[PDB]
Amino acid sequence: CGKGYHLMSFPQSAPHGVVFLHVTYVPAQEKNFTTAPAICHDGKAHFPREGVFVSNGTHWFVTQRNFYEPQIITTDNTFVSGNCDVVIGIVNNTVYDPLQPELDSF
Amino acid sequence: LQPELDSF
Amino acid sequence: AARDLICAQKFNGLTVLPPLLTDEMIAQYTSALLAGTITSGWTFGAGAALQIPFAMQMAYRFNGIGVTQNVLYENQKLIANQFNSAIGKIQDSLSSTAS
Ligand SMILES: *[C@@H]1O[C@H](CO)[C@@H](O[C@@H]2O[C@H](CO)[C@@H](O)[C@H](O)[C@H]2NC(C)=O)[C@H](O)[C@H]1NC(C)=O
Ligand SMILES: *[C@@H]1O[C@H](CO)[C@@H](O[C@@H]2O[C@H](CO)[C@@H](O)[C@H](O)[C@H]2NC(C)=O)[C@H](O)[C@H]1NC(C)=O
Ligand SMILES: *[C@@H]1O[C@H](CO)[C@@H](O)[C@H](O)[C@H]1NC(C)=O
Ligand SMILES: *[C@@H]1O[C@H](CO)[C@@H](O)[C@H](O)[C@H]1NC(C)=O
User: Residue A91's beta-bridge partner residues?
Assistant: First the structure.
């Protein structure tokens, strides 16, 4: 349904056939980052449910794999499901609880 | 997920 | 030696045209597809190549069948050795068991 990430289509009447107009999502401008399979925090290997762990060089972000929308590392889009001494690629970082800045610091 | 608020 | 079968095919007008893509450039297509599958993954089918480590691509291909991506990240060596032994079984089947 179109070369790329397909969105929708338009049928159009044509002589002895049909013509589609596949509206298609296509990414254009790339950027290079530093990635890791998981995040060891307190002996727990956090790795995201939807996003990909990337860093620009100083801080780590959890943005999705189709559009750069960098978000802070929080236990809402990351699940542990293991330990951090098993996987090959891992880096040391911190994951902040969402409970903390609204009740614990508050 | 309570014990870090009162039991800590 | 003796007269060949292909010479008898050729001498009676049954000529065979070569393919446009020869075996070297077909192997170049295959190697480009393999390098884009390993290095870029599935993201080179939607424009340009977008680099990824192979463990991440195998994780994001486990996510597409309803399996969480902790399965390989606790068992990367086992899946890698299973893939190596399976492709060795394919190699031995191509070597001996022509079926
Ligand atoms: C990499 O990303 C970090 C995270 O945003 C950037 O750090 C920010 O820099 C701006 C500019 O001085 C500050 O206003 C922010 O407060 C910083 N964030 C934090 C959390 O301290 C950093 O500048 C980026 N580096 C590059 C080279 O792009
Ligand atoms: C899941 O199955 C795999 C094989 O499909 C098991 O891997 C083998 O385990 C035995 C244990 O004695 C080893 O001797 C073999 O060398 C392993 N095969 C390999 C590494 O290719 C695996 O142990 C099974 N999982 C569990 C939890 O038993
Ligand atoms: C990012 O940096 C690497 C480091 O050499 C470079 O090869 C690459 O072209 C850069 N850009 C992208 C989009 O990856
Ligand atoms: C990550 O941090 C832990 C403790 O904070 C340490 O034991 C471990 O060696 C560190 N690993 C790396 C690769 O720096």
Answer: A39
Question: Which of the 8 DSSP states describes residue C66?
Answer: T
d(CA A8, CA A2): 9
Measured from the Cα of A56, ligand 1's closest atom is 1
What resolution, expressed in A, was reported for this entry? 3.3
Q: Helix (H, G, I), strand (E, B), or coil: what is residue A55?
A: strand
Q: Structure solved using which method?
A: cryo-EM
Alpha-carbon span C65 to A66, nearest angstrom: 20
Distances from the Cα of A93 to the Cα of A43, A73, C26, C55, C87, angstroms = 11, 9, 45, 20, 37
- Ligand positioned closest to the Cα atom of C78: 2
Q: Which of A29, A31, A32, A54 to mutate to test the pocket of ligand 3 (most atoms within 8 A of CB)?
A: A32
Amino acid letter, residue A7: L
Q: CB under 6 Å to ligand 1: residues?
A: A 56-59
